[PDB]
Paper text:
The type IIA DNA topoisomerases (Top2) are nanomachines that control DNA topology during multiple cellular processes such as replication, transcription and cell division. DNA gyrase plays a vital role in the compaction of the bacterial genome and is the sole type II topoisomerase able to introduce negative supercoils into DNA, a reaction coupled to ATP hydrolysis. DNA gyrase A and B subunits assemble into a A2B2 hetero-tetramer of approximatively 370 kDa forming three molecular interfaces called N-gate, DNA-gate and C-gate allowing DNA binding and strand passage. In this study, we reveal the complete molecular structure of the E. coli DNA gyrase bound to dsDNA and to the NBTI molecule gepotidacin using cryo-EM.
State 1 was solved at 4.0 Å using 60,548 particles and State 2 was solved at 4.6 Å using 53,655 particles. The 4.0 Å (State 1) and 4.6 Å (State 2) structures of the DNA-binding/cleavage domain bound to the double-nicked G-segment reside in a configuration similar, but not identical, to the cleavage complex in presence of DNA and ciprofloxacin with a RMSD of 1.78 and 2.01 Å, respectively. The 2 conformations mostly differ in the GyrB subunit, more particularly the TOPRIM insertion that rotates around the GyrA N-terminal arm with a 5.0 Å upward displacement. State 2 corresponds to an intermediate opening of the DNA-gate therefore referred as a pre-opening conformation, when compared with the larger opening that can be observed in the conformation adopted by the hsTop2β39. State 1 and 2 correspond to a conformational oscillation before the opening of the DNA-gate. This pre-opening transition is mainly undertaken by the insertion domain acting like an anvil which positions the TOPRIM domain in a configuration ready to perform the opening of the DNA-gate. The subtle swiveling movement of the GyrB insertion domain around the N-terminal arm of GyrA leads to a controlled stretching of the G-segment by 5 Å and spatial separation of the TOPRIM and Tower domains, a necessary step for the formation of the groove that will accommodate the T-segment. Although the overall resolution of the pre-opening state is lower, a density for the gepotidacin molecule could be identified at a lower rmsd level, suggesting that the gepotidacin binding site is compatible with conformational fluctuations at the DNA-gate. In this context, the pre-opening conformation of the cleavage complex represents one of the discreet steps that DNA gyrase undergoes to open the DNA-gate. Conformational changes of the DNA-gate from closed to pre-opening state may conduct a signal to the β-pinwheel through the tethered acidic tail promoting a β-pinwheel vertical movement.
Numbering used by the authors:
A (entry chain A), C (entry chain C): 8 to 422, 427 to 443, 446 to 524
B (entry chain B), D (entry chain D): 402 to 474, 483 to 790
DNA sequence: GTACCTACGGCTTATGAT
DNA sequence: GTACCTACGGCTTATGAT
DNA sequence: ATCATAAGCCGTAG
DNA sequence: ATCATAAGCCGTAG
């Protein structure tokens, strides 16, 4: 049986692949700034239980675990992504605190996956905080046997802090890193004023940030990129001339190279250009880098001002390179060029939703706990008749039935708010002194011990009851007015800013 | 070139032997372990192959083994291996490399495609084994129909309707139409919420003539909002609103929902009422309400339980059917046994090939790699 | 500081390496017949919890786990060892039930470690049965953080069933497989007669066994090997002539090849020899093997008897190959050539030790449980005074002190053997009616629930008490006389033989 | 040969630069990352190298890079790299490859070893970091002495002996002698059980003159068996027996122990009494019994606890010392940082090299590979 | 994503020398 | 135990042609 | 002297 | 024409 098929099927195949790739592999999201690979790796590290204050663990365990349960797409890319996060000179804020040969700026690759030791950092727990409190949704795996969180309940806009650079079948994005303190300040300013202008946001955040300092010249490019989404910016290295107090000779000191520059390739290209006579004023070349900071020495040829040579280098050498700013991400699963204000608004909305869901979950939990404690205290009030009823009843099920069938006296020492002390699904036929039990309450009573009959357990129960009342009152209050919610958000953001504050690295010299 | 990878058959006469192209190691191992030694030939592949248009250079060549072994690269003289078959994984990467190979052959040798020699295999996708009962399934629709059949293997419903024991092709067609409508609703869910769409199954009908009396509109929207509030067990609210945008009436209801922090309205328009989707919804709702399926009794095949919802009964039946089945999904050619691979992919009596056509001369390949077609084509909304 | 060192250090280095290798890598033990790699793999599979009646699991998970926790010596050798066990044509009884491309007789290697699915078999649980009952010792890992069992509490002499073949710096061993039923019969015969002769053991076990059948000719070699430890034995393939009912022509059918023979290499060598004119009477060559059994067809040249050609093949072709029997293993960590009787005796002694230790552990556990149940029943006897004592005492510690300080009445309904109902460490100042409690007993009383006050819990407690009495009596009895121990061993071995019985594969034709 | 692997230094004059030989990737990576660029050279190695005697063939060559880069393979003309250093892992495989390299050089070029040019490095073995206090330890004995020092950092014992506060070098030497005796007992444990050896610490002395009175022998063996039965908390028993093998007495006690299923005797002989091991045991037992260390009070450094056993007190002190320390063991050259590797292995002021000698011309290499020496040499009993 | 090197013993198989 | 091939877009850098 | 053609790099994937 | 020397393969390890 060979049915005839049209050649047009070629379009249906390529379109499916392109859509699947664009949706699932390259483009990150505005709410996390993380790729699904990073998502699965972080989720696996969290489920395994590798905190920052614990012993190190081998990389093979984590790699095999991720391959087996969540990411069945090889090991090479996974290991490369893991090594990428541990490099200090590759990200403004590292996420995977490791120990071992992780490569360096010299382009040398890291060691095998059977030597390194990795674990989470203190900042990593700030990303996946409040996970088990039903704050996000769960997505099934490839075979429908596990659950994967859709979005991370984060507290820091990692998209604007670190950024990424990927290329898809149709689009390509690239975002520079930034400083955390200025991002928090801009978020606070936007919380203060929803109708803030671009100049007001640009005033708080002058420019981007890099793990290694540099020099920025063009101011029009960064403004055009912040306003529209595309622009160009130049990066200049830090150098200077040196003349001895005596006759001596001129000398150039290199303190830092631009972002994403190979040192060995750069030195090789400089040596080649010197050999090719294309550059003048250069005699020799040395290196003085150590564990105290990178230091490159270039000997200036005799009878040379050196400034013209340095300008020629800046014109030709990789010490001056541009940058293709391109901000493209997903908003509802669709590539859309979005500005700073939209990202900030989406972050605020995500935070509001997470806080609301966490509050609802905590309120339901506290309601259930208080409703159980009420019946427990009622059972503590009258004890002796329950003792006789248990002693007479042969069957525990019959004892439960007898307990449910009979009302209770509600002693004076036993006897809060008018409402909010009962679950939603609870029927009005219970708790109308007058009081009735429930099969669940009866089982909870049957699950009591003898230690709960001391002169301290009663006081502990009363204290817990009052505490739960205060907690549910505060939760109802924060659910009532959104102003308290905004105050809580502001306080949490200020605390986060106070925790992980730092100092500027790069420098912006306008022309 | 000729050694190392190509493992030809005993026969040297073309148009009798078949050539295959798969991933090199994981597939070629089992392929050679299970192949015949009379008219079978296998040429492994390593990774991917460069595109023709993205980088066009007659001097550019990395493998060249395919062309070197098929022809001299010009073709009318030597036409060895008149029959070729492409076996490929069922993933998106397999489909991608398949598209690359197809466009490569199309742009290199048009005659081998015009004369009807290219063939595409259809590897299995699911292996269902219910104890002794085994089954090989290749498509998602086939899997779904098989599941529906396993669920509808001889049930018998007993409602208080005109039929004491309603069962058979009528019930099966009703379940199929219900599944199609649920799929349509899941597709349209991107626009409107799902609660109202699910409730319209039991809500009464609606007609544009109802825009005369405000009392009828108010009664309908009140019943709707009340039943929504009743069925809502999560943290959401529902409010009603009647709007008049006309010279006199043009009654237009507005449904107000209150989620976590933001309310959202959903007015009703003449276009939405006239839409074929809403028309099908109303027709199926009338058909289902004319069933009186409240007190029901259906068994498959030794147990029955009266419920209050047809979808709940359907879910219970699907659960009872899926209790004791086993399914294995083959996610790669290097995953099954050589005998299974042979019998299910390249058995001249059990395989299912596919023929390519030369229907029209179009600019699909031209729009392929320009980035302009790449930007404009994703219009799948 | 450069201290002068003698060149003699070369001897101290090589000796250490040789000793370490010989002790830890190559030579197996007589009590398990397993290498430390197999030991660690089986222990990891047991700790992970991959039984036979469970879902399959990826190989990457197990490989990474073994590398991380127990065997930090690469992955290639581990994966090769894992694949070796799953091959049916490589062992008489497979241990790792897998699913996927595991290679075949054609010499083709298996797929990558990211495709296969493996799990334990029903026979595997018979190897590591009764592990957590303190039956063997625990050995520390390389960093002293984990525990590894020294020997496996096995029930089947895997050394004689499967055997192995390794080569050390000084020695080299090789043992053919055998049949399980005859080994069990020989063990039973040795249990019957400790002074059995070699002929009596040889009478029950004619010869070895192979996963694929073969033909054995030399009888002196196997006897000399069983008596001393070294010998030679020849292996012959199974073939036959074929003549059609009509004129036709002669044809040779190959049904099986000898042990450890590559089919592709064999066919290539035969084709080469035919091309080189070294062999006569051969015209062509074909293959008819399928999924129903291997079948090789050789076309006999016209005008040829074929028997002379077949004899020439048997003389030259690999169809007839010898075998270097060499039985060398460890007895107390020292390579010692040992015969069959010594291996059987060591197996019996190991089984006796395991059974004795398991019995002691079970007896101690039952003693502790019964001693706790006694105090629990005593507390069940008198309840009301305990209720008042708990109601008056504010502090639970003070309540425990008051309970311990006061004697008890030992009601008539509360009131076994004269002894064996109390632990060893128990002091004679308790349980002298008269009865006293203990802080542990008092805490157990405090850890009671209300469900234990029904008309069924008392009967359940009495039944459990009588059952524990019967169990400790039976344990004391089996510890008393060794005849009951030998009877239990015999019954267990007979049950094992009845479970995993099979039929002979190979064939022995004496000359 | 010269490219690819060898990374020479700027200086071309020999006898000033140093050459190193390590495992290729895992070691050479960090080595080149941390090396200097003035007088440093690194030649990686891939796996192992064939032996000289096991397979001797002048035509046999696989790498040949070492010889090709050091000399012309004949040596007096070119003597480049007058100084060589061998860095190797601390495992048994590293020691094996070290032995192979040593015998290779010895059997190829005797002059380079005679003139004193071969050197062996001593990589660190332990990294102990007690918060701010760090330490680099290379040997097991050094690690043990460091642990003993950390445990004996200023303790002060208070017994009821002649010294009210006994502490210092006397106590430290006593602990060292006790540890040496415990090591000797652990070594001799292969012959005799450990219970009796541990109990002889507190059991009274014994003399060959005690073979006159049977009552004294009976009293001693009865006390021994009684204390053994008292200390035995596991499932074992102990019985006594007095034997006379002489013309008149030659009193010889026999200790009968009952393990799981088999009893075992252990008579006492004049040779065992005269042995230096038993003599040292008796001397240390007398020294310890002459201490009256029952009621003791030792603190390190803010807590003390009276116990009834000196070994129990020692274990408690070791536990208190090892509470808050951290240890990392480097099990490979490709495990530490490049700066640490430099500073701790190839720092011309912090390293610790080793010189080889040409003391005697012996047949060790001859006995190496004959299988006769291989069979006869394992006499380590 | 993948092709060739070593130890270690015991066995063999093949090929030039006495 | 290890060296070279591809897609995919956006950017650049270099080099021969108008 | 000023425009068209050949490369390299960025990150997942094989 | 009959004995001494050079290989390949088997499985853990690097």
């Amino acid at each position: 049986i060979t049915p005839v098929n049209i050649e047009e099927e070629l379009k249906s195949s390529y379109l499916d692949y392109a859509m699947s790739v664009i949706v699932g592999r390259a483009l990150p999201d505005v709410r996390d700034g993380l790729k699904p690979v990073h998502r699965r790796v972080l989720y696996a590290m969290n489920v395994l239980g590798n905190d920052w204050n614990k012993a190190y663990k081998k990389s093979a365990r984590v790699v095999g675990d991720v391959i087996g349960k969540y990411h069945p797409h090889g090991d090479s890319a996974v290991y490369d992504t893991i090594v990428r996060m541990a490099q200090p000179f590759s990200l403004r804020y590292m996420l995977v605190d490791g120990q071992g040969n992780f490569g360096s700026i010299d382009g040398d690759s890291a060691a095998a996956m059977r030597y390194t030791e990795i674990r989470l950092a203190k900042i990593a727990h700030e990303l996946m905080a409040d996970l088990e409190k039903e704050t996000v949704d769960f997505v099934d795996n490839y075979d429908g046997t596990e659950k994967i969180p859709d979005v991370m309940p984060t507290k820091i806009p990692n998209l604007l802090v670190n950024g990424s650079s990927g290329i898809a079948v149709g689009m390509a994005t690239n975002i520079p890193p930034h400083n955390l303190t200025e991002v928090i300040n801009g978020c606070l300013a936007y919380i203060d004023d929803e109708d803030i202008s671009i100049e007001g946001l640009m005033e708080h955040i002058p420019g981007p940030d890099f793990p290694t300092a540099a020099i920025i010249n063009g101011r029009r490019g960064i403004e055009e990129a912040y306003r529209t989404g595309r622009g160009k910016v130049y990066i200049r290295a830090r150098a200077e001339v040196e003349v001895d107090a005596k006759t001596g000779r001129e000398t150039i000191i290199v303190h830092e190279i631009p972002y994403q520059v190979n040192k060995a390739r750069l030195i090789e290209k400089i040596a080649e250009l010197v050999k090719e006579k294309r550059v003048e004023g250069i005699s020799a070349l040395r290196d003085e880098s150590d564990k105290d900071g990178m230091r490159i020495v270039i000997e200036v040829k005799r009878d040379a001002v050196g400034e013209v040579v340095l300008n020629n280098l800046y014109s030709q050498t990789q010490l001056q390179v541009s940058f293709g700013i391109n901000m493209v991400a997903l908003h509802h699963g669709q590539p859309k060029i979005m500005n700073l204000k939209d990202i900030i608004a989406a972050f605020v909305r995500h935070r509001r939703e997470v806080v609301t869901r966490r509050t609802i979950f905590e309120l339901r939990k506290a309601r259930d706990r208080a409703h159980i404690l009420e019946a427990l205290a009622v059972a503590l009030a009258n004890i002796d008749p329950i003792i006789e009823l248990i002693r007479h009843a042969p069957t525990p099920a019959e004892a439960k039935t007898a307990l449910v069938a009979n009302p209770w006296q509600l002693g004076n020492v036993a006897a809060a708010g008018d409402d909010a002390a009962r679950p939603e699904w609870l029927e009005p036929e219970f708790g109308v002194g007058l009081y009735y039990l429930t099969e669940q309450q009866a089982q909870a009573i049957l699950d009591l011990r003898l230690q709960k009959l001391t002169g301290l357990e009663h006081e502990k129960l009363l204290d817990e009851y009052k505490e739960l009342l205060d907690q549910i009152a505060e939760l109802l209050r924060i659910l009532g007015s959104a102003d308290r919610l905004m105050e809580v958000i502001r306080e949490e953001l200020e605390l986060v800013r106070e925790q992980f504050g730092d100092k500027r690295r790069t420098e912006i010299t306008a022309n | 070139g000729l050694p190392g990878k190509l493992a030809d058959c005993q026969e040297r006469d073309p148009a009798l032997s078949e050539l295959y192209l798969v991933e090199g190691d994981s597939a070629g191992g089992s392929a050679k372990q299970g192949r015949n030694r009379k008219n079978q030939a296998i040429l492994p592949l390593k990774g991917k192959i460069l595109n023709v248009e993205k980088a066009r250079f007659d001097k550019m060549l990395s493998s060249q083994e395919v062309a070197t072994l098929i022809t001299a690269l010009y073709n009318p003289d030597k036409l060895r291996y008149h029959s070729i078959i492409i076996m490929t994984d069922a993933d998106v990467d397999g489909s991608h490399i398949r598209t690359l190979l197809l466009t490569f052959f199309y742009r290199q040798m048009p005659e081998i495609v015009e004369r009807g020699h290219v063939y595409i295999a259809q590897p299995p996708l699911y292996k269902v084994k219910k104890g002794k009962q085994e089954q090989y399934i290749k498509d998602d629709e086939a899997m779904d129909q098989y599941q529906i059949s396993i669920a509808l293997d001889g049930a018998t419903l007993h409602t208080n309707a005109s039929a004491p024991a309603l069962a058979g092709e009528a019930l099966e067609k009703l379940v199929s139409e219900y599944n199609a409508t649920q799929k349509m609703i899941n597709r349209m869910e991107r626009r409107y919420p799902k609660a109202m769409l699910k409730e319209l199954i039991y809500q009464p009908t609606l007609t544009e003539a109802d825009l005369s009396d405000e009392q009828t509109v108010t009664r309908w929207v009140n019943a709707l909002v009340s039943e929504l509030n009743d069925k809502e067990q999560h943290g959401s609210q529902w409010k009603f609103d009647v709007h008049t945008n006309a010279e006199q009436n043009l009654f237009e209801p507005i449904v107000r929902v209150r989620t976590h922090g933001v309310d959202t309205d959903y007015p009703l328009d003449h276009e939405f009422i006239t839409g074929g989707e809403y028309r099908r919804i109303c027709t199926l709702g009338e058909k289902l309400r004319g069933l009186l399926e409240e007190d029901a009794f259906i068994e498959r095949g030794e147990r029955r339980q009266p419920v209050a919802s047809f979808e709940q009964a359907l879910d219970w039946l699907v659960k009872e059917s899926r209790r004791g089945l086993s399914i294995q999904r083959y996610k790669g050619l290097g995953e099954m046994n050589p005998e299974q691979l042979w019998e299910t992919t390249m058995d001249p009596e059990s395989r299912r090939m596919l023929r390519v056509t030369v229907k029209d001369a179009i600019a699909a390949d031209q729009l392929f790699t320009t980035l302009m077609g790449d930007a404009v084509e994703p219009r799948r909304a």
